[PDB]
From a paper:
Following two rounds of multi-reference three-dimensional (3D) classification, 186,161 particles yielded a reconstruction of the entire human pre-B complex at an average resolution of 5.7 Å on the basis of the FSC value 0.143. The human pre-B complex comprises U1 snRNP, U2 snRNP, and the centrally located U4/U6.U5 tri-snRNP, which are loosely bound together to yield a highly asymmetric and dynamic assembly. The tri-snRNP has the appearance of an irregular tetrahedron, with its four corners corresponding to the U4 Sm ring, the U5 Sm ring, the U6 LSm ring, and Brr2. Neither U5 nor U6 snRNA directly engages the pre-mRNA in the pre-B complex. In the pre-B complex, Brr2 is connected to the core of the tri-snRNP through three patches of direct interactions: between its NC and the Jab1 domain of Prp8, between its NC and the convex side of three tetratricopeptide repeats (TPR) of Prp6 (residues 272–373), and between its PWI domain and Sad1.
Pre-mRNA splicing is executed by the spliceosome, which undergoes an ordered process of assembly and activation prior to catalysis. The A complex associates with the U4/U6.U5 tri-snRNP to generate the pre-B complex.
Numbering used by the authors:
A (entry chain e): 4 to 81
B (entry chain A): 224 to 284, 292 to 445
C (entry chain C): 112 to 158, 173 to 943
D (entry chain f): 7 to 48, 65 to 86
E (entry chain W): 103 to 565
F (entry chain A): 1113 to 1168
Write the structure that this text describes.
């Protein structure tokens, strides 16, 4: 499916993850679990106060992700 | 209209065996290493006769340096088989020449004289693996005898089916049969061609003959 | 094709999802068919080598295949011919590629070329992954029991691991099923699987159980208890087959057995359990085709190989750090080495040309290369650097604009606008400028980058063929043709002698024949005459000369006393392998030599040069009381003498061939003080004479190249093989049965000259059962003495062994030296 | 079923927070997870994937 | 600046007009001439036949055939400061516009190293007994002033690391060097060897110079003209410098400017009918104008000539007098014809049909072709001067291929005007001889070049 | 002779006459040194005769 194939297909590629509380995390995802929980490396987190927090590794939960920004060119589907 | 046959394998294997006497010995195609059309074109082109092959009318129609004997090292003397095999090295002025030379993984065909138990526990050759080294390749996989609970209701997919079946041997045998018997469904053919004598035609060096047969 | 092009461009741009892959496997172990099947999966658009049935040339294929995760991957695959003679293409492929995949036939077991390929990969520091092709042979040909099959499988992997351990002192990696390094695949029936891959399939069919943990305990000495549930170490006396057998080989056999064995009575129900859906039409196919279809549906796309490639391949990023030290002459330090390592499309960029791919229409051919750094745009003008070109040697170098770029699917040419570094690419318009291996650089840019070391060949070319066009007036056309083949083939070495005979050097018959054929039908129209095949020889001296001739120069400003004696048993071989090479410090090198061979410390100090090649068999040594007294001048004279000595060693004093395994030693050096230009100019010619004279004084040396031969044969024909070898002066080394397969392996050696037509004779006598591969391996002194006037040579009749040396010597001289 | 008629079409997705997503509907799942192409929030998100847990309403905002 | 080995140089053993190969490797790549034995060796580096040769054959000064540089070995350095300007010039002659005017020499009597004494452009060529035809075309084209001056001072063309504005390929670089060579006022010997050019034109497929069984001055002229126009061409320097004024087969294609102008003419044929049926006109561009030659018996034995036909030779004069077009429109093919020469080119090649290779070996058309025109007043001038006897344009003979009937092949000798001494000049296999221009016609004419004056009344007035 | 007739190809012998009547071992051997001498000698003699009087 689109969540699965593009989820694990984005491993190693830069992607943006927007949490439910408004925390945006942009970076290269290391892996995507079937539970939708993902782990990103060298991800930049921007809080609601405008504070940019650069983390070497971050693990985002599946239920805590509101949406995700996939890379421009890849084919899971047309 | 009696075109397009589909065969039960059992029928096919039975017929094959009855035609077994007519059938050639060897499943592989390596036997006919020298049985090459390209070779025959080249032989005619190079005007060279292969020991026990066909001869032919000649296709169309001097001290030199390389010829000289004192400068020649001979270990082995360039036999005509080499000239035909590599006619642009062996043979000068090749024209319209194709590349004979078929090299492939060795063809091994297994058959058993007595049915025994379907399948064979050990090969006829009986080559021994006799794995030999250190601690027989220690494997550090999933935590055995610990966290490897395993999954309930799961089993190998092919376990229910038997490894071999009463017709397994026959099925395998039909993989290496002369062309009309290797297909369950094969195209219907006329009797216009003539005979199945080509295997007989293919004989290389029978021996105990008058030339009569060589011709 | 445009959508695909966009996706390909994105993948190329990423440079981490694309890993260059090169696969080499013994003749007929299925590399070519595997690639063909992969291409079919990738592009359902199905639009000399073919007739021969043997790959003669390496072909590069680029494809995008989804893995188990589903992330798209970019793979550059270069297929290398299995045949040992055409190994050179494989070496080129290995140099271009990051990692090499090894293919081994299950039934055949370890084979000649497998070993050689593994050794080359270890030397070249490329990660090695091995796929076992023709897995079905045991099941459907050998009919080995599943336990038996597992035993045979364990053996091959163990042997491969042993070879890797032997080649590299450090055991960074070992190949095992648990690691995922080795993939069990059969190319023909479209089943490619690894324990991980099989585990994934099992998980998909079943509930959701964790695949990785099951895979780890899945293969190698693990027993699964049904009552126990989770896998555990074997504790059942009753005996349940190792879990590899229980979960993999058992069901694999059962699938195959049903389809071949029944196919009507019970085959459908088995399919239901499997869940495969079959058309009635499909079930009416012949067994091989039907079996392949069934297997394809059950095994998915071709996932194991892709998984292996993504997982254990360093790819573009790691790429250069291991690669550049061997490849780049600078080896990194200040700029270029660092830049190459990053691999970004910035600054110097860079290209490396390791191949020339011929065009049918014209002599010019498209070059193939792995873009090392930055990126290349169509119509840009790029500097070309020859292997000859170094630091400040502008005359060899030439610069030309790039007409077009192509990305190569199997024998299809995708035009593209630009190519990022780390991607294989065909370059139009660089054909005239480059000979053999080449380096492409920023054109007119200051940049300055050392050329990548030229290809170093696993074999040594030995077989010499003379060529002359039938009609003299067509000579220049033939010469043109020869140029083309020099570009087309890697090791193919040509030369023009003093006589004027045009000579081609090759690796063996098949190589030579194919080269001849290719030139004749594709490069030059002209009819070509050909001399009978002859081996080169090498010259060595059996014993030291009692008296050393000392020769003055044209102007008698100096004299040189030099002796010669054959080098030690384990000296020449080490010298060449660079074990005791001239690069090392005098203290380090001398000490090493003394320790290894009980070398004198003083003699070690006295070592000057290795003669003909930077790594060469010959040694130049200075041992005089006088030299120490006036060293200043002595160093300069020694350098000039060493150049002269180098010249002398390559040419020869008998057959005008290379001198092998000889130490030359200076005992008296006479140079007039303040010699100036006199010494500088006169000494070199003199030195050449000096070398020869000592060679004349220091015994007679007999040499001939020998081939290592592997013969695979049934038990009944071993006697015939032995007889052929005995007939041709061969001698057999080892005769041993092949484990897990029926057949004997015969290893033997055979003189190069006597090897002509050996293959063919062997096959003919054994009714096409025995098969021989042959590779240059070993030099060995010929029975006949180099000089024997009392020996009378009959003009046609083959001579007896006691004086072959004379025959060879004289005839070779008559061919050119006179 | 009805999911095949909306394939390769531009729909309008509403979330639980009141945000509207207008993009080309590509693929979905049994969990109602919409993958929109060239989506525009009411900032251009472009290619994005929205969860079905916070989904509210899915309407057709224009021809495919 | 005595690099003392300069003393060892043997000018008299150089010969650049040899195939550009190492004599002991037969590679073209990085070829160096030894200046002491004049033998080619592939080179620079240690194990190169040039380096080895420099030391086993004691010959240190070399010339890099493909790059304009000299090297002194054994060290392997370049001789920066090159009194070998003499040598380099015998490789690669170089000219500035002054030189082509300069002396009005027109062809001032040069010396070679042998002190043999020959008029610069007016040089013969070795091995006429296999390339005599080729030597005739090469001397025709290298006589035509716009063509010749183009090559002689277009030094830009095909270096290694040239700019972008310059290239055209190996065929044109070599024909350029042939032309340069044949005008060289300081040739080391009197005569030149185009045998390698010719063989490269058969062997180097980008020319399929692959004509045989005829292989004449006409055929080779055509094959050359066509080739040059394809191989220098528009924007790719080969149609701007060519000169699409200097002829103009004005009908079609304008190709390399110089030889679609500069060798084509246009005959507008004009088919007519009576009644009111306005039959049709066919302009055709043509680099060489095939004259017929009336009805020579050929399958008829002889004592020929004055006892079958010579004198009235001249069935021929300006034969057609308008070709098919003016008086004798005996135009057998159809209803009415006249064949006007409607463009009239700054040269005009004529080619006499001397014979029908369609049949046997050939009894030719020997009927002598009397235009030794003798007419200028100030005459005995061979005043050639052909004026159009319906219009005026006024043209002076300036070349004249002759056939000769050697019992072995053929032969093809070539007679060139020399405006400035006013002396016709035969060359005949490295031989040269002056010829009475009124007696030219007593050979079997084959090909003439006819310059346009009165266009030099446009350029007698246009200076 | 070489200066008078120098060819890169050195075809020379291509046309060089010999006797087909004798067996190969008896018939004249072909060598550049031999063949170039042959052509040089012939050439030298040919050049002593005016074409207008006679030729060879
Ligand atoms: N048993 C078995 N044989 C196979 C399979 N795939 C290919 N072969 C056979 O192995 C032989 C060699 O296969 P190829 O792929 O053509 O060999 P290649 O590697 O492409 O060409 P070379 O490199 O010259 O060996 C052929 O005779 C094939 O029929 C397979 O899956 N199983
Ligand atoms: Mg292959």
């Amino acid at each position: 499916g689109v969540p699965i194939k593009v989820l694990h297909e984005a491993e190693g590629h830069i992607v943006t993850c927007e949490t439910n509380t408004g925390e945006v995390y942009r970076g290269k995802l290391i892996e995507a679990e079937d539970n939708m929980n993902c782990q990103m490396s060298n991800i930049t987190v921007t809080y609601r106060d405008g504070r940019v927090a650069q983390l070497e590794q971050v693990y985002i939960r599946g239920s805590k992700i509101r949406f995700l920004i996939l890379p421009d060119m890849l084919k899971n589907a047309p | 209209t009696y075109q397009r046959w589909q065969f039960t394998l059992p029928m096919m294997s039975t017929l094959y065996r009855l035609a077994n006497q007519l059938l050639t010995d060897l499943v592989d195609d390596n036997y006919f290493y020298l049985f090459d059309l390209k070779a025959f074109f080249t032989s005619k082109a190079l005007n060279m006769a292969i020991p026990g092959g066909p001869k032919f009318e000649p296709l169309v129609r001097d001290w030199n340096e390389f010829n000289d004997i004192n400068k020649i090292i001979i270990r082995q003397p360039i036999r005509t088989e080499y000239k035909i095999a590599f006619p642009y090295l062996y043979n000068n002025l090749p024209h319209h020449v194709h590349l004979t030379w078929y090299h492939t993984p060795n063809v091994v065909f297994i058959k058993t004289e007595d049915p025994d138990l379907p399948a064979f526990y050990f090969d006829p050759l009986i080559n021994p693996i006799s794995h030999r080294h250190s601690v027989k390749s220690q494997e550090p996989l999933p935590d055995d005898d610990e966290e490897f609970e395993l999954p309930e209701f799961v089993e190998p997919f092919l376990k229910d089916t038997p490894l071999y079946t009463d017709n397994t041997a026959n099925g395998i045998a039909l993989l290496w049969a002369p062309r009309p018997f290797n297909l369950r469904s094969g195209r219907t053919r006329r009797a216009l061609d003539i005979p199945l004598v080509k295997n007989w035609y293919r004989e290389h060096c029978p021996a105990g003959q008058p030339v009569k047969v060589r011709v | 094709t445009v959508y695909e092009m966009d996706f390909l461009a994105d993948l190329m741009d990423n440079s981490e999802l694309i890993r260059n892959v090169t696969l080499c496997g013994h003749l007929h172990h299925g590399k070519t068919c595997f690639v063909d099947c992969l291409i079919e999966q990738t592009h359902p658009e199905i639009r000399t080598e073919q007739e021969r049935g043997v790959g003669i040339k390496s072909t590069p294929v680029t494809v995008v295949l989804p893995d188990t995760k589903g992330k798209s991957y970019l793979f550059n695959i270069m297929d290398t011919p299995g045949h040992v003679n055409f190994s050179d293409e494989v070496t080129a492929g290995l140099r271009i590629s990051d990692g090499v995949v090894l293919f081994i036939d299950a039934a055949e077991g370890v084979m000649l070329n497998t070993e050689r390929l593994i050794k080359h990969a270890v030397q070249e520091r490329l990660a090695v992954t091995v796929c076992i092709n023709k897995i079905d042979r045991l099941i459907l040909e050998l009919k080995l029991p599943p336990t038996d099959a597992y035993y045979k499988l364990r053996h091959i992997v163990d042997e491969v691991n042993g070879l890797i351990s032997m080649y590299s002192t450090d055991e960074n990696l070992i190949l095992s099923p648990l690691l995922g390094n080795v993939c069990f695949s059969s190319s023909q029936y479209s089943i490619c699987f690894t324990l991980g891959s099989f585990a994934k399939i099992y998980a998909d069919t079943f509930g959701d159980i964790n695949y990785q943990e099951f895979a780890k305990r899945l293969w190698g000495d693990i027993y699964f208890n049904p009552k126990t549930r989770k896998f555990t170490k074997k504790a059942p006396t009753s005996s349940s087959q190792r879990s590899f057998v229980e979960f993999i080989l058992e069901p694999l056999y059962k699938i195959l057995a049903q389809v071949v064995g029944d196919v009507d009575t019970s085959l459908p129900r088995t399919l239901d359990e499997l869940g495969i859906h079959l058309t009635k039409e499909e079930l009416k196919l012949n067994i091989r085709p039907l079996l392949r279809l069934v297997c394809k549906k059950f095994f998915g796309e071709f996932t194991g190989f892709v998984d292996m490639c993504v997982q254990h391949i360093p790819s573009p990023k790691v790429g250069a750090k291991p690669k550049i030290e061997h490849t780049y002459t600078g080896g990194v330090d200040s700029d270029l080495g660092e830049a190459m390592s990053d691999c970004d499309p910035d600054g110097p960029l860079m290209c490396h040309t390791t191949k020339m791919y011929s065009t049918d229409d014209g002599v010019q051919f498209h070059a193939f290369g792995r873009v090392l750094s930055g990126t290349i745009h169509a119509g840009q003008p790029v500097k070309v650097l020859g292997e000859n070109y170094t630091l400040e040697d502008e005359e060899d170098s030439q610069i030309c604009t790039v007409g077009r770029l192509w990305i190569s699917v199997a024998r299809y040419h995708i035009e593209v606008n630009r190519v990022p570094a780390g991607n294989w690419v065909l370059i139009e318009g660089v054909d005239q400028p480059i000979v053999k291996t080449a380096t492409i650089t920023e054109p007119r840019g200051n940049e300055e980058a050392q050329i990548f070391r030229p290809l170093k060949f696993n074999t040594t070319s030995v077989i010499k063929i003379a060529v002359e066009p039938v009609n003299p007036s067509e000579l220049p056309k033939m010469l043109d043709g020869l140029r083309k083949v020099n570009k087309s083939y890697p090791s193919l070495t040509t030369k023009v002698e003093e006589s004027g005979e045009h000579v081609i050097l090759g690796t063996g018959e098949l190589y030579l024949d194919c080269v001849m054929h290719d030139l004749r039908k594709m490069y030059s129209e002209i009819d070509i005459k050909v001399a009978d095949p002859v081996v080169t020889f090498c010259e060595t001296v059996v014993e030291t000369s009692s008296l050393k001739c000392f020769a003055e120069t044209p102007n008698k400003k100096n004299k040189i006393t030099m002796i010669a004696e054959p080098l030690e048993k384990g000296l020449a071989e080490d010298i060449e392998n660079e074990v005791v090479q001239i690069t090392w410090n005098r203290k380090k090198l001398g000490e090493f030599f003394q320790t290894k061979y009980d070398w004198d410390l003083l003699a070690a100090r006295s070592i000057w040069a290795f003669g003909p090649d930077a790594t060469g068999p010959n040694i130049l040594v200075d041992d005089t009381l006088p030299s120490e007294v006036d060293k200043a001048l002595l160093g300069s004279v020694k350098d000039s003498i060493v150049q002269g000595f180098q010249w002398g060693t390559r040419e020869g004093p008998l057959c005008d061939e290379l001198i092998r395994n000889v130490k030359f030693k200076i005992l008296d050096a006479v140079v007039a003080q303040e010699p100036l230009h006199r010494g500088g100019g006169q000494i070199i010619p003199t030195a050449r004479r000096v070398v020869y004279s000592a060679f004349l004084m220091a015994t007679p040396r007999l040499m001939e190249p020998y081939y290592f031969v592997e013969v695979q044969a049934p038990a009944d024909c071993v006697s015939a093989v032995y007889t052929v070898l005995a007939r041709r002066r061969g001698h057999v080394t080892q005769d041993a049965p092949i484990p897990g397969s029926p057949l004997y392996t015969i290893k033997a050696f055979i003189p190069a000259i006597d090897s002509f037509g050996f293959e063919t004779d062997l096959r003919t006598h054994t009714q096409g059962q025995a098969f021989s591969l042959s590779v240059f391996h070993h030099w060995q002194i010929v029975p006949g003495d180099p000089l024997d006037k009392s020996i009378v040579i009959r003009p046609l009749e083959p001579q007896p062994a006691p004086h072959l040396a004379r025959e060879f010597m004289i005839k070779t001289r008559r061919r050119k030296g006179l | 079923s009805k999911m095949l008629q909306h394939i390769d079409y531009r729909m309008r997705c509403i979330l639980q927070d009141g945000r509207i997503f207008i993009g080309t509907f590509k693929a979905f799942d049994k969990h109602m997870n919409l993958i929109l192409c060239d989506c525009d929030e009411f900032r251009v998100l472009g290619l994005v994937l929205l969860r079905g847990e916070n989904l509210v309403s899915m309407t057709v905002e224009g021809p495919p | 600046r005595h690099c003392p080995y300069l003393d060892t140089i043997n000018r008299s053993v150089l010969d650049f007009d040899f195939e550009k190969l190492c004599s002991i490797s037969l590679s073209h790549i990085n070829a160096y001439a030894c200046l002491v034995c004049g033998k080619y060796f592939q080179g620079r580096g240690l194990k190169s036949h040039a380096y080895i040769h420099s030391v086993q054959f004691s010959h240190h000064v070399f010339l890099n055939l493909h790059t304009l540089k000299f090297y002194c070995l054994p060290d392997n350095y370049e001789i920066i400061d090159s009194s070998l300007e003499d040598i380099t010039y015998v490789l690669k002659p170089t000219f500035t516009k002054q030189q082509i005017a300069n002396l009005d020499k027109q062809a001032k009597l040069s010396r070679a190293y042998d002190g043999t004494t020959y008029l610069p452009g007016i040089v013969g060529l070795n091995n006429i007994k296999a390339n005599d035809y080729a030597n005739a075309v090469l001397q025709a084209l290298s006589n035509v002033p716009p063509l010749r001056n183009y090559f002689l001072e277009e030094d830009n063309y095909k270096n290694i690391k040239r700019p972008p504005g310059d290239i055209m390929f190996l065929l044109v670089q070599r024909f350029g060097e042939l032309m340069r060579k044949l005008w060289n006022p300081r040739n080391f010997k009197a005569h030149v060897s185009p045998h390698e050019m010719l063989q490269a034109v058969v062997l180097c497929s980008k020319k399929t110079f692959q004509i045989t069984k005829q292989g004449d001055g006409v055929d080779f002229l055509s094959w050359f003209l066509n080739a040059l126009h394809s191989a220098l061409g528009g924007t790719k320097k080969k149609k701007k410098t060519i000169v699409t004024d200097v002829f103009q087969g004005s009908m079609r294609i304008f190709t390399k400017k110089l030889p679609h102008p500069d060798l084509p003419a246009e005959e507008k044929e004009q088919l007519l009918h009576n009644d009111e049926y306005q039959e049709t006109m066919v302009e055709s561009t043509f680099m060489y104008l095939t004259l017929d030659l009336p009805t020579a018996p050929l399958y008829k034995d002889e004592k020929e000539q004055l006892i079958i036909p010579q004198v009235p030779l001249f069935n021929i004069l300006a034969k057609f007098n308008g070709i098919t077009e003016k008086e004798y429109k005996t135009y057998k093919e159809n209803f009415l014809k006249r064949f006007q020469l409607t463009k009239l080119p700054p040269y005009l090649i004529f080619c006499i049909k001397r014979f029908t290779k369609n049949n046997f070996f050939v009894e030719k058309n020997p009927t002598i072709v009397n235009f030794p025109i003798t007419n200028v007043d100030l005459r005995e001038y061979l005043s050639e001067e052909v004026q159009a006897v319906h219009k005026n344009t006024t043209y002076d003979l300036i070349a004249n291929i002759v056939h000769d009937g050697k019992p072995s092949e053929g032969s093809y000798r070539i007679h060139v005007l020399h405006h400035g001494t006013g002396k016709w000049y035969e060359l005949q296999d490295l031989q040269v001889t002056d010829i009475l221009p009124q007696m030219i016609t007593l050979s079997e004419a084959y090909i003439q070049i006819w310059k346009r004056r009165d266009n030099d009344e446009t350029n007698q007035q246009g200076a | 002779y070489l200066t008078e007739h120098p060819d890169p190809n050195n075809e020379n012998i291509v046309g060089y006459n010999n006797k087909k009547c004798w067996p190969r071992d008896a018939r004249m051997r072909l060598m550049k040194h031999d063949v170039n001498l042959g052509r040089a000698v012939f050439w030298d003699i040919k050049n002593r005769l005016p074409r207008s009087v006679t030729t060879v």
